[PDB]
Amino acid sequence: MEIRTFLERALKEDLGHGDLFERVLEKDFKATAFVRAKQEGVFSGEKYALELLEMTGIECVQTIKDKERFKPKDALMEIRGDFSMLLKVERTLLNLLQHSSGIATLTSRFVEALNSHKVRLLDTRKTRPLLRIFEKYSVLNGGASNHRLGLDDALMLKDTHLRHVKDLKSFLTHARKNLPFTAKIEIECESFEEAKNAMNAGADIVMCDNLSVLETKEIAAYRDAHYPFVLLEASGNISLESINAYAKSGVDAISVGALIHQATFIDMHMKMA
Amino acid sequence: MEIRTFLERALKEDLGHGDLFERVLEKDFKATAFVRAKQEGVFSGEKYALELLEMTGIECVQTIKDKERFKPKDALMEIRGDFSMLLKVERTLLNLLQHSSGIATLTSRFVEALNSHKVRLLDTRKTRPLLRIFEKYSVLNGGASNHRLGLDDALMLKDTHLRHVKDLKSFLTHARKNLPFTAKIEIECESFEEAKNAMNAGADIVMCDNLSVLETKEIAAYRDAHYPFVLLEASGNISLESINAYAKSGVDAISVGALIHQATFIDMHMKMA
Amino acid sequence: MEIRTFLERALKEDLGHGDLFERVLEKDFKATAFVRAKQEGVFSGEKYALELLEMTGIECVQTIKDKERFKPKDALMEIRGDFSMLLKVERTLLNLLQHSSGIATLTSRFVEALNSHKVRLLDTRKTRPLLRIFEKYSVLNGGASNHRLGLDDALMLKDTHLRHVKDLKSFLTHARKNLPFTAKIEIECESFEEAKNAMNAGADIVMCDNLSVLETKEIAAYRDAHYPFVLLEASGNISLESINAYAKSGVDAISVGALIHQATFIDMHMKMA
Amino acid sequence: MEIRTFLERALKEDLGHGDLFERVLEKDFKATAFVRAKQEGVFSGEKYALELLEMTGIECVQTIKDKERFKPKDALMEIRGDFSMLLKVERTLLNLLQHSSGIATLTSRFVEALNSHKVRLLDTRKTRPLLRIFEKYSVLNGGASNHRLGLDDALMLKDTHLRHVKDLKSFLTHARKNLPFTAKIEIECESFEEAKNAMNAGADIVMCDNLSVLETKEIAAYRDAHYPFVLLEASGNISLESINAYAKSGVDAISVGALIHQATFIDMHMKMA
Amino acid sequence: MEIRTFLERALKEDLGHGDLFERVLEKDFKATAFVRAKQEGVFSGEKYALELLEMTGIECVQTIKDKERFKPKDALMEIRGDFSMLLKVERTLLNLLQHSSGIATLTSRFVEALNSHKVRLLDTRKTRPLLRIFEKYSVLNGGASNHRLGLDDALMLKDTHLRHVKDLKSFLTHARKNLPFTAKIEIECESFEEAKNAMNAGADIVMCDNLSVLETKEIAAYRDAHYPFVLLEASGNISLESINAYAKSGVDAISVGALIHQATFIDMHMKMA
Amino acid sequence: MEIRTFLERALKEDLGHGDLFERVLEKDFKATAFVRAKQEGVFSGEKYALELLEMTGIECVQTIKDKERFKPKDALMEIRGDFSMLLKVERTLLNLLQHSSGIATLTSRFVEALNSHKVRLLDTRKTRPLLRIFEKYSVLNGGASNHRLGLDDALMLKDTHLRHVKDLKSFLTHARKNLPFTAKIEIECESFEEAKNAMNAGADIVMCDNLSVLETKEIAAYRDAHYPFVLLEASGNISLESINAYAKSGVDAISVGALIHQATFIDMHMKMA
């Protein structure tokens, strides 16, 4: 299964040489446990939790679904299996749920503020090591959309790249044959001129990086009139305070890496009996 | 070495099928880049960064050391290697430095509030999946200390476990032979009676869970008089506000999972030329 | 190295428990070997071969480059290292070069018959197990272009997918929110009505699957008329005798799986001398 | 499963970050699919395909067996499972069956032209990277026999090895002590004098490399005369037009690498219906 | 689970390219086999055996438990599965049971000689490569106890380390903050003075290395009077002959690496029908 | 490198979460260490030790070679590198050397007793899990020879197999085509009749299992007269006391699994300065 190895590694780091408790547990037995919320938020991590339980021979009796909202004291999951295994898995289970839900929850807050159905919210490649796929998945559960998953997914030319590109148009024109047939090319721009030049060069997507709303609206209006098929993306420390403003700029999407890199754990715990 | 595989996997999830840019880069060449801070903070991730650079054939010309304070616009590292590789590693390098430094920085703030050289600040087993070792290492660079690293490091018995133990003293006495000779046993207690009882039962360490400063002080005073070599730990939603007051209870340590699960990325970026 | 693992596994399956010759070679010594052609074709596998020698401690004294033409008796590579190691890697080296060159060479012939700079030759996801990246790379060295690398690279919908779909336009308009921001959506069509239907649905790419030049040209002219930004791809048993004809249907690309699944080894061998 | 890892890796290289279709499929459901032929040939890959479906949770309702002949339009397999999973494994399934069957089919033709039960058809160590075991297995399903599986399986010495050797008889008499007790030693010979030399040296097998039938027959008659227990193998560009002739030289086996390195995919496809 | 990978690798080294017998087995079929002892001893390896059987699809009908005594001709296990698999697993199954039981048996003999329920018998970090966890587990089944499991479990300072420590007390005092909160520190001492000094410096455990019984007694008596909670361990070529005398010195434990490094295979075999 | 992964895993199990000492080492520095013998024996493990040192960045200044004899107090290796790394590697280095040398030494004792240059000493497939290749290598350094390395190396039909083989001759005759061309077939026999039947059936090798010397001589004499090309092997709890007797039986080789499964650690240690 696609994420099985991920769960194996998550567990392995916690068990190390082997759980010490099972060495002294006088008698193992079947038991039921509940994952309860101690804070409100939106649920994420279901796909991983279920794969983890199945892998460890733990039964998932009941569980709320990804994207579902919850309140403190709410029971999020009911699991049953060997007492020794419920304990060996406890932390790994909670940590992945609290982290995933943390991202989904923070993300849902940005979805509300953005308040739009025409403009999608996006993440970035700023993700914690080994957690890209995990965290991208978590953003989906917050109600937003994902940007590319890696460096093979699409071509994104930013400031650093552009400095070594004499004549963008020529570059983009002859880059197509060396890129996979289905690849889009995005160009990071920091001024109306740059974006305009990007569009004329043959950019599939143009990012309006660190630009005022006015500056962005100008570029969006220009795009609508001359390059109707170029997607526009706004980004650059966009906050909960300014996200709505940019939603009205005319851009197609808005990316904020904070959805992932400023997310924190939603409080939860596991209780027996 | 110990963390090479970690870096390989971190990089692998970003490269996927293969970096697209290197497919169109007309000509590769050696270049120098600098990792610059965009916020104030304490550096962390040095050990991982250097291994990452060495693995990819990138030279580390200069770098500040783990634990060093830095300010915005400060050059954290200077590296040199193939342009294509610098770009292929950039995000992986920045993500691990921003995450690790975020933890160290938040941690350094609790250390400040703690304001004590006798009491130790500790993390918890609440870490992000696959990042146990990474994050525990980050807490150290913040100036705090680590709690156990896993379920194999020490035995920690709490409510969940205790509910199934008839005679705690008997259990601990006969548990030593089935545990590695060097392991310590910690008992989580929610009352003075419980703490006192755990000490008599033979606990090496007692956790004063969710107790007031006064409550904790009473336990510490009892420990000092009757079980001088038993270690005391305070925990349970300790904040930057209450942390100092707890440092005066007489407890030996104070654990706060938030050091890791409430930490966020410190802002940085990489610049060429 | 992104392909380092690939090479370890290739070498491992041939050495098994361990090479038997090294068990009897009384004295090892530094030696030189040459990789010569016994056929003519285009070279491919340079990237993998160099990493292979690097890994095994063999020195690459000289080597022609990928894409370079060669003919019988040509010395393609000169290598030097321990005699035992040269024999242990011999077969692994030749097999990947002969297989890679085989694909590039067969690909270059289709490149000719195509004879065009306005039309791109594309491969397919029809590749040998565990050799995708290896074979897509081999095609490039043949002068052609690669199609997507996998199922994560882009969304390719065919009747199978749309079978249980009734409003293509709405279906795609919603897929966008759930697909990564940079992903293109291609639709396979076996009739004019389908292509025309796709373009109106909002497809980024339309495949003219198993259709006549007249049928293709019909779709092209239509595309040229109303949807100029919709790439068109022709495929379906395109042969080395009909590729040129389709290149004149006004299609942007022509994909042929045969480039990979019909390629065969190019005769080569290694001599000590 | 001995080949379980092989299948995980084959599937992994196609899914990459994750299949994009499952991201948009609003509702998954159980479905059935058929693997049909578009050509005729001998089936191969049964073993790998079953393990593949097992791994992915797809049910194999019906399937022809390895070695079984088939013709265009024949339904080779009937499978059932989640719609999303059938699409995710489709290509991986077909590629291995088409590639495996391709080798078995080409192998069966050489089996005919050979037309003999006293002579064995053998493959070579010339196989595609990472596919040795897979391709040797494929040859068997073609009706032929496998040669050694690797360099650990047996000792095969050629001029390259003996170049710096002056007493074959003593050299081999000593190799025995250093080789595993059960290993056979084969020697490649390009002249009568060499074969005659090998047999006297104590070789278990002699290869008649790139020699005429008359030359081969000379060595055979000699073998039949003094060394009846020395297997003889003929090889060296043996073609589908000269294989039968060599089979009459009194040789025990004829190896032809082309069985694998010249085989190509057999046209097949998958339909839902 | 925790040891599945271990069993996979154990099996993989025996199967290599693939079991030859299954290539000629005319027809496979279900069969029952018994693992029988050919010597007297204490059973060990149950946990590994069961995981091994489950992994390979073999049913465990019956089995004695770890720690149980057995005699020659005793049936240790009864299993059922495919004939081919039983043969493919036989050696792997027997090797791990004979090795593990050999350790448990030798261990049970030192336990007998020790003749005490207050003193613990311990192993060491002297284990065979890749078998640390396997062998530590085997010692337990012999009735003894385990020492630390690795270099991460506890801190052990001996001659090599001490030679570079100016002030031992200072070092230990300031080392606590840099070690996991739960770790114990053991000091290896070669004299009464050293032991006494280590106790004053703050050692959690003191090893009485290569000291006479009288010497060890003096240290134990000192510990009892001044450092009651410091743990004492005796070691250094302790034999079956001297072990009992040491158990009377007052020390808490006695470690002997020989339990593992001088253990040998207990004789067993597998029978069909 | 073929055994690199083996060493990585050996180290990994000892380091676990990470060496605790390096956490408190005030200052690292370069240092020299010596591996000294504390008991006489024959050296084995060189190949692994060197690969281990190179992997950990430790320099091997001096080292005796595999097969070389040593006496107590003798310095076997002189290594230099970071103090922290010499300590992290110490146990892994010693354990592999003491175990390998232990096997080589025990083996050399059997070589002497056998006292022959015409009869080779052999091992079996009775090896500790994960150590087959390691232990087979160790036997070579004792002065003996190896039997097959696994189940793919050769075909060995024993009692269990034979029970399901009606008509051996027919079986062996038609098994050749389904086995790799170079494979030998050995048959385990427990009586003159069985061996005779084995020879007539077409056995490449015949094992004289659990037979008296007389019984074996009879079979050897029969072999010399009728099947001069069949190799003979004696086995069945052959000891140091009876090995010489069997050497005079006329058999080609003698196998004793004890060379490996009854071997124990040769005492050694590491000293600084």
Ligand SMILES: O=C(O)c1cccnc1C(=O)O
């Ligand atoms: O590279 C990306 O995918 C990306 C996309 C949008 C915004 N930022 C980034 C970034 O990480 O720099």
Ligand SMILES: O=C(O)c1cccnc1C(=O)O
């Ligand atoms: O288990 C631990 O290591 C731990 C130690 C201190 C505080 N909390 C925990 C926890 O994760 O529950």
Ligand SMILES: O=C(O)c1cccnc1C(=O)O
């Ligand atoms: O899915 C693909 O990548 C693909 C692209 C072009 C032609 N065929 C295919 C196919 O294998 O169905």
Ligand SMILES: O=C(O)c1cccnc1C(=O)O
């Ligand atoms: O080495 C082999 O296995 C082999 C066996 C038969 C024919 N050729 C070869 C070869 O690749 O050189």
Ligand SMILES: O=C(O)c1cccnc1C(=O)O
């Ligand atoms: O390091 C250990 O764990 C250890 C513990 C007790 C006795 N010896 C050792 C040793 O291997 O040196």
Ligand SMILES: O=C(O)c1cccnc1C(=O)O
């Ligand atoms: O199987 C073997 O290789 C083998 C060879 C000789 C003696 N015993 C065995 C055995 O392990 O049963």
